[PDB]
Amino acid sequence: KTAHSQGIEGKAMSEEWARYYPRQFDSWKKTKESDNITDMLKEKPALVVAWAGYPFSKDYNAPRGHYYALQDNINTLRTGAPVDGKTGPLPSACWTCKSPDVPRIIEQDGELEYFTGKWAKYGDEIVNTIGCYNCHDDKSAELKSKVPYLDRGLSAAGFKTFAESTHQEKRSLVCAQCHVEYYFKKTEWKDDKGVDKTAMVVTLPWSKGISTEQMEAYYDEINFADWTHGISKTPMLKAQHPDWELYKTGIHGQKGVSCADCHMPYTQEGAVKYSDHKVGNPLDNMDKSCMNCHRESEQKLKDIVKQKFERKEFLQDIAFDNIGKAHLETGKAMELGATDAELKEIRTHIRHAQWRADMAIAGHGSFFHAPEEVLRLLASGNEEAQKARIKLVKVLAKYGAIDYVAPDFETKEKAQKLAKVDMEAFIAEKLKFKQTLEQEWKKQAIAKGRLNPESLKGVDEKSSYYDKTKK
Amino acid sequence: KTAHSQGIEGKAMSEEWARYYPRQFDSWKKTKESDNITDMLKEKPALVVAWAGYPFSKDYNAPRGHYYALQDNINTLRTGAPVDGKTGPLPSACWTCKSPDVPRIIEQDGELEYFTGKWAKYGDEIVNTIGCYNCHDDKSAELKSKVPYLDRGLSAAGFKTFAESTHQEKRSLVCAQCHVEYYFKKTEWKDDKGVDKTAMVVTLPWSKGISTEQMEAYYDEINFADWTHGISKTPMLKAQHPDWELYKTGIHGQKGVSCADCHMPYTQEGAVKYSDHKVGNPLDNMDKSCMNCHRESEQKLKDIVKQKFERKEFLQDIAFDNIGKAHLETGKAMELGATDAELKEIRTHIRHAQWRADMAIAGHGSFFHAPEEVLRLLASGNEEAQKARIKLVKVLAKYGAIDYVAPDFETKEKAQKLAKVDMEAFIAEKLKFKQTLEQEWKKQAIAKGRLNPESLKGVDEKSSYYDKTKK
Numbered sequence: 032k033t034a035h036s037q038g039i040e041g042k043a044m045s046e047e048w049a050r051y052y053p054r055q056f057d058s059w060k061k062t063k064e065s066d067n068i069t070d071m072l073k074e075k076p077a078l079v080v081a082w083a084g085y086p087f088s089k090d091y092n093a094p095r096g097h098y099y100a101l102q103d104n105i106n107t108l109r110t111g112a113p114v115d116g117k118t119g120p121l122p123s124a125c126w127t128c129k130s131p132d133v134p135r136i137i138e139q140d141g142e143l144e145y146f147t148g149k150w151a152k153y154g155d156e157i158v159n160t161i162g163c164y165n166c167h168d169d170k171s172a173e174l175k176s177k178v179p180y181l182d183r184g185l186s187a188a189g190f191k192t193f194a195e196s197t198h199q200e201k202r203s204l205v206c207a208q209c210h211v212e213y214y215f216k217k218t219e220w221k222d223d224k225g226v227d228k229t230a231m232v233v234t235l236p237w238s239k240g241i242s243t244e245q246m247e248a249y250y251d252e253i254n255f256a257d258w259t260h261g262i263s264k265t266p267m268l269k270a271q272h273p274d275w276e277l278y279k280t281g282i283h284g285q286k287g288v289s290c291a292d293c294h295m296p297y298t299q300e301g302a303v304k305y306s307d308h309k310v311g312n313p314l315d316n317m318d319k320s321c322m323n324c325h326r327e328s329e330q331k332l333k334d335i336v337k338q339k340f341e342r343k344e345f346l347q348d349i350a351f352d353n354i355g356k357a358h359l360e361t362g363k364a365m366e367l368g369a370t371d372a373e374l375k376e377i378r379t380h381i382r383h384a385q386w387r388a389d390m391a392i393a394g395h396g397s398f399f400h401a402p403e404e405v406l407r408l409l410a411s412g413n414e415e416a417q418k419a420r421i422k423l424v425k426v427l428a429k430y431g432a433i434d435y436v437a438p439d440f441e442t443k444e445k446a447q448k449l450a451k452v453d454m455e456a457f458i459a460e461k462l463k464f465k466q467t468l469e470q471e472w473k474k475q476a477i478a479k480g481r482l483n484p485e486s487l488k489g490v491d492e493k494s495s496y497y498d499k500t501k502k
Numbered sequence: 503k504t505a506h507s508q509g510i511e512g513k514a515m516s517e518e519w520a521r522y523y524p525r526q527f528d529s530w531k532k533t534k535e536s537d538n539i540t541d542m543l544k545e546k547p548a549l550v551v552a553w554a555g556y557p558f559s560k561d562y563n564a565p566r567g568h569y570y571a572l573q574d575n576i577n578t579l580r581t582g583a584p585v586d587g588k589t590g591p592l593p594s595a596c597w598t599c600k601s602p603d604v605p606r607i608i609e610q611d612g613e614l615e616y617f618t619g620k621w622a623k624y625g626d627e628i629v630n631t632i633g634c635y636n637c638h639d640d641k642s643a644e645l646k647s648k649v650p651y652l653d654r655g656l657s658a659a660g661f662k663t664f665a666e667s668t669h670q671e672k673r674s675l676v677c678a679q680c681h682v683e684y685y686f687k688k689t690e691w692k693d694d695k696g697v698d699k700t701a702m703v704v705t706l707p708w709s710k711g712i713s714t715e716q717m718e719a720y721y722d723e724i725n726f727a728d729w730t731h732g733i734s735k736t737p738m739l740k741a742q743h744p745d746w747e748l749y750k751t752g753i754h755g756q757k758g759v760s761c762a763d764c765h766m767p768y769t770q771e772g773a774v775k776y777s778d779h780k781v782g783n784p785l786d787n788m789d790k791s792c793m794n795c796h797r798e799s800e801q802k803l804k805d806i807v808k809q810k811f812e813r814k815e816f817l818q819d820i821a822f823d824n825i826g827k828a829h830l831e832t833g834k835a836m837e838l839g840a841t842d843a844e845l846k847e848i849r850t851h852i853r854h855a856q857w858r859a860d861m862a863i864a865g866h867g868s869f870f871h872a873p874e875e876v877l878r879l880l881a882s883g884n885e886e887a888q889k890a891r892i893k894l895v896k897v898l899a900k901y902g903a904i905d906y907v908a909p910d911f912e913t914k915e916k917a918q919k920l921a922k923v924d925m926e927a928f929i930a931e932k933l934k935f936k937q938t939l940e941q942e943w944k945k946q947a948i949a950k951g952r953l954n955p956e957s958l959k960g961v962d963e964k965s966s967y968y969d970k971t972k973k
């Protein structure tokens with residue numbers, strides 16, 4: 032047994048686990064070191080055009096340390112600026128993979144109630160970031176999945192549930208609670224008080240399998256669309272960090288190497304084994320992350336990975352360039368009078384092209400986890416985009432614009448102008464929210480004892496629209 | 503020293519090495535077992551359209567055992583039907599990588615003289631297939647490159663020459679004498695008798711590096727073309743088995759694993775080490791070819807390779823389908839009156855598209871040797887093909903044929919009709935050559951003592967146009 036066999040009071044606050052596991056707590060806290068904000072819309076402006084009419088066209092950055100998950104969820108322009116618990120663009124489900132307070136609330140009010148309402152609904156309740164309670168049982172300390180949607184998805188795909196899985200499998204599944212592709216399923220229900228409510232439930236699109244093509248069929252079957260493209264009016268599908276799905280197809284995954292083997296390597300200290308909880312870039316600690324299975328210069332193994340990234344970059348820029356043009360070209364055809372009937376096939380091609388290319392790059396580590404599947408996906412996506420463009424030339428010609436040249440979008444500024452994103456307005460509105468409602472959420476959380484001010488140190492120094500500079 | 507330190511009389515005939523190395527001779531002879539003829543034009547008819555106006559549109563099969571190299575060189579419709587030593591479509595250089603008699607003749611008459619004349623010129627001299635003398639010194643038995651063009655290419659690429667290379671490097675370089683991409687360079691010269699002659703010299707296009715892109719620049723720099731496309735009239739480049747070039751970029755090659763490690767694995771017998779000389783498919787002898795570095799089921803490792811092949815097949819069919827259409831679409835534009843000026847950019851795209859896609863698949867093992875580079879190449883080639891097709895739609899529209907649909911070429915028959923290849927005629931002409939001139943070459947070679955009838959056992963049972971069935 033553990034020294035807390037009856038549970039941990041205040042288990043949602045990771046600082047509560049420190050008295051029992053000082054080592055793991057210390058390394059866990061160090062993800063604070065990965066504080067770099069890389070503006071992906073600035074790096075790859077093509078993404079703005081691809082996501083026109085969707086929140087990702089406003090703000091989308093690379094991931095950083097777990098230490099910042101909760102705050103980045105709050106800072107991103109995607110969550111907008113609620114004025115109370117009933118306003119704001121996004122639903123409560125957006126907290127799901129950002130805090131140990133999520134399973135706390137689910138266990139208190141039930142899954143459906145948790146998935147009911149606006150994101151702003153839990154502003155003063157979900158205030159702790161990725162913590163011990165997200166992956167550990169507070170009585171046994173054993174690995175555990177705290178979200179019901181994972182097993183639900185695993186079963187639907189023919190996989191064993193978390194409890195049915197081996198230990199090595201669990202070392203990757205704890206990650207799969209969040210590092211997977213998903214969609215919100217509108218779900219009607221009635222509470223114990225009889226009132227009718229609508230919940231937006233996190234759902235893993237795995238009922239037909241976990242390959243990109245299988246997930247594609249899954250979405251097409253129910254005619255699902257995350258949004259109607261702001262430019263081409265195409266029924267779009269958004270891929271979101273399908274890290275685990277692509278990892279499973281890669282060689283490492285097929286050979287049984289877990290996420291933890293590379294991101295949370297062990298350090299043996301005479302009979303005692305410790306897992307490095309500083310989840311980050313394995314290439315920064317290759318001796319422990321890689322050289323326990325590989326025998327050769329860290330630099331060469333590093334160079335090899337660098338090569339894979341370049342390959343991915345090459346195909347990525349090609350695919351999204353043609354996807355961007357397809358969108359704009361379709362928008363032009365619309366302006367000239369093209370009918371939805373004349374554009375249906377073109378739109379289906381664009382939908383599939385972006386779904387495949389987005390699935391390939393949405394998982395930032397996929398280029399390494401499953402390099403071959405990534406390249407094949409980008410190639411397949413590009414082909415679908417070009418098929419749409421070839422047909423687009425004819426539609427354009429019919430309407431007298433065969434020589435139309437889609438506008439360029441080589442900078443975030445130009446791309447956002449095409450996507451009609453009024454950044455200044457969104458940022459101004461966001462800051463007002465942060466300076467008012469946000470501070471009230473934190474003050475209330477601290478007063479009620481749900482948040483420890485210590486966890487806020489340096490957590491809000493940066494975002495894509497501001498940088499207080501230092502630490 | 504060896505038991506033949508002063509050389510081997512009749513060294514070109516591998517049977518002459520048997521008294522000294524019975525083991526190696528026995529396994530070397532067993533490539534006779536790989537006698538399967540796979541008609542690639544039948545399997546991938548798109549290839550016929552791609553090679554319209556070139557010999558490969560007539561006959562192109564997968565490679566088989568070294569035992570059949572010389573005879574397949576004679577059987578392929580590509581070499582046609584000479585009536586004497588001064589007739590026939592191809593030059594003397596076509597023997598180069600098929601026989602140990604090649605270095606024999608080069609060492610006797612000089613490189614330029616060897617590369618001067620028709621293929622038919624040496625019909626009764628080059629009669630032994632891939633043998634000991636192609637890779638071994640007949641005095642020391644050490645590995646050696648017997649063709650000057652290899653070092654010439656290695657140097658030009660900044661690589662060390664064969665003599666300067668390590669032993670492990672030599673275990674791959676002996677293969678690179680033949681398993682590389684090349685082109686024939688028209689070379690003017692004068693013999694010791696003062697007569698002016700023109701030779702077609704095998705040249706490795708490595709002066710700018712060995713990547714596909716570098717080789718592409720190499721060819722474009724000198725405005726080189728292997729042939730003018732029979733359909734699109736595009737200045738085409740033919741990729742030929744760049745096995746070593748792509749292998750060098752793959753992980754195994756980067757890690758120092760030689761061609762021999764997988765294709766000619768060792769078998770330790772108490773202090774004595776023997777190299778399996780039965781060069782073939784490593785997957786048929788995984789225990790010796792792979793499981794000496796890898797530790798897991800042969801079936802899983804086999805399945806993983808099967809997955810790579812499927813990925814390659816997927817992208818290959820897409821790329822060559824669009825390349826085929828581009829060619830046909832260009833041919834249509836020509837019929838309508840499009841000028842060379844209006845088609846120049848389109849043709850450059852097609853040239854580059856096919857060069858990249860052909861380089862990716864011309865090496866039948868590349869999908870495994872360098873899986874990622876193969877996929878990237880097919881993706882890049884497809885993109886170039888689609889860029890050409892997008893521009894082609896506009897040219898077609900200008901000439902009133904925007905709705906033109908390129909004809910299908912899903913069977914070798916239909917594809918060869920489009921490429922205007924009169925198979926029946928070529929085959930009839932070939933058989934007459936085989937029944938007359940060929941038999942005379944062999945009878946004369948046997949009479950002069952250059953060929954041992956034993957080496958002809960079952961060597962001419964199959965081709966792409968006939969199969970005497972059994973052994």
Ligand code: HEM
Nearest residue numbers: 065094095096099100103128129165205206209290294311
């Ligand atoms: C499981 C052990 C697990 C792994 C592995 C994992 C990896 C991971 C990485 C490598 C990053 C980026 C780190 C960096 O850039 O320095 C990262 C980022 C996020 N993760 Fe994660 N993660 C694992 C588990 C979990 C779990 C259980 C959740 C969900 C509760 C989760 C969520 C996130 C979030 C959110 C981010 C983004 C952080 C930010 O940008 O603020 N991860 N993870």
Ligand code: HEM
Nearest residue numbers: 091092093094103104107109125127128209210213272393
């Ligand atoms: C709700 C739609 C939702 C929001 C909003 C949200 C935000 C968010 C941010 C701001 C980041 C940082 C990176 C960025 O700028 O985009 C981030 C990162 C990850 N998220 Fe998220 N997230 C929302 C929903 C979900 C859901 C339902 C899950 C879990 C199933 C989830 C998980 C993660 C993970 C993991 C990452 C890190 C890896 C990556 O590629 O970003 N998010 N999220």
Ligand code: HEM
Nearest residue numbers: 045048052055056059161162163166202205291304305306
């Ligand atoms: C939170 C600060 C936190 C604590 C505390 C904690 C403890 C803990 C222990 C005691 C172990 C076992 C011994 C060891 O160090 O290996 C352990 C192991 C793993 N943990 Fe953990 N852990 C904390 C947080 C987290 C979070 C946020 C996750 C999930 C993303 C997580 C995951 C893991 C994994 C995986 C292991 C290794 C499992 C194994 O190999 O048996 N921990 N943690």
Ligand code: HEM
Nearest residue numbers: 094206210274275278283288289290293312313395396399
């Ligand atoms: C398992 C399913 C698993 C998860 C989860 C995971 C996540 C993860 C993320 C989110 C990234 C991107 C981080 C970012 O900041 O962009 C990422 C990157 C890398 N990973 Fe990973 N990873 C999982 C599994 C594995 C395994 C099994 C290994 C080791 C073989 C591994 C390694 C890496 C590496 C390397 C990277 C890229 C580092 C870089 O180039 O910066 N991951 N992972």
Ligand code: HEM
Nearest residue numbers: 282286288292293313314320321323324332335402753796
């Ligand atoms: C650490 C982050 C790490 C790196 C770096 C790394 C690299 C690597 C490469 C380049 C390959 C080849 C396949 C490809 O190009 O995609 C590869 C293959 C295997 N690895 Fe690995 N690897 C890293 C970490 C680990 C760890 C911690 C293990 C051991 C549990 C491991 C194992 C393997 C295995 C097995 C393979 C499959 C191929 C094989 O060698 O049989 N790797 N890795």
Ligand code: HEM
Nearest residue numbers: 536565566567570571574599600636676677680761765782
């Ligand atoms: C070097 C040791 C070397 C290797 C490795 C190699 C491989 C190889 C394979 C795997 C095949 C196919 C075998 C089969 O299908 O069963 C094959 C085929 C040909 N090769 Fe080769 N080869 C090596 C060396 C050499 C050398 C030095 C030459 C040139 C003199 C050469 C040539 C060829 C030819 C020709 C073929 C095609 C045979 C046919 O289809 O008739 N190889 N080789």
Ligand code: HEM
Nearest residue numbers: 562563564565574575578580596598599680681684743864
């Ligand atoms: C001359 C232009 C020339 C001819 C003719 C020729 C023929 C030939 C045949 C018939 C095969 C069997 C496979 C097929 O049907 O195409 C074959 C195979 C290989 N060749 Fe060849 N070959 C010619 C020239 C050259 C030259 C100059 C070299 C060496 C630099 C060479 C090498 C090889 C190799 C190796 C193969 C096997 C691998 C493959 O992909 O076919 N050939 N050749």
Ligand code: HEM
Nearest residue numbers: 516519523526527530632633634637673676762775776777
């Ligand atoms: C021809 C029938 C032939 C003979 C005979 C022969 C002999 C031979 C010996 C004695 C060795 C060394 C001991 C061993 O078995 O490893 C050896 C090694 C290699 N050979 Fe060989 N060899 C014959 C033919 C060929 C041909 C056609 C090639 C080239 C394609 C070739 C290549 C090699 C290679 C490579 C080795 C291993 C080198 C090493 O690891 O030191 N041989 N052969």
Ligand code: HEM
Nearest residue numbers: 565677681745746749754759760761764783784866867870
């Ligand atoms: C080194 C430069 C090298 C050569 C030469 C070589 C050649 C070769 C050929 C011609 C093929 C295609 C054979 C056919 O009949 O289609 C081929 C195929 C495979 N090879 Fe190879 N190969 C070279 C090197 C290596 C190395 C280092 C390995 C082992 C890691 C290796 C393995 C294989 C495998 C596997 C195949 C594919 C088998 C199949 O799927 O049928 N080769 N090689």
Ligand code: HEM
Nearest residue numbers: 282325753757759763764784785791792794795803806873
């Ligand atoms: C035998 C023909 C053979 C097979 C099969 C094989 C497979 C294999 C795979 C699938 C990889 C992963 C990379 C990829 O997906 O492309 C891989 C990687 C390495 N191998 Fe291998 N391998 C075969 C043979 C051999 C032999 C004979 C050696 C040993 C000299 C060898 C070595 C390696 C090495 C090193 C790697 C690089 C990645 C790593 O594990 O560090 N392989 N192989």
Ligand SMILES: [Ca+2]
Nearest residue numbers: 213269270271
């Ligand atoms: Ca999604």
Ligand SMILES: [Ca+2]
Nearest residue numbers: 684740741742
């Ligand atoms: Ca060539």
Ligand SMILES: [Y+3]
Nearest residue numbers: 040041047050
């Ligand atoms: Y406590």
Ligand SMILES: [Y+3]
Nearest residue numbers: 093094095096
């Ligand atoms: Y990062």
Ligand SMILES: [Y+3]
Nearest residue numbers: 402403873874
């Ligand atoms: Y690979």
Ligand SMILES: [Y+3]
Nearest residue numbers: 511512518521
């Ligand atoms: Y003798």
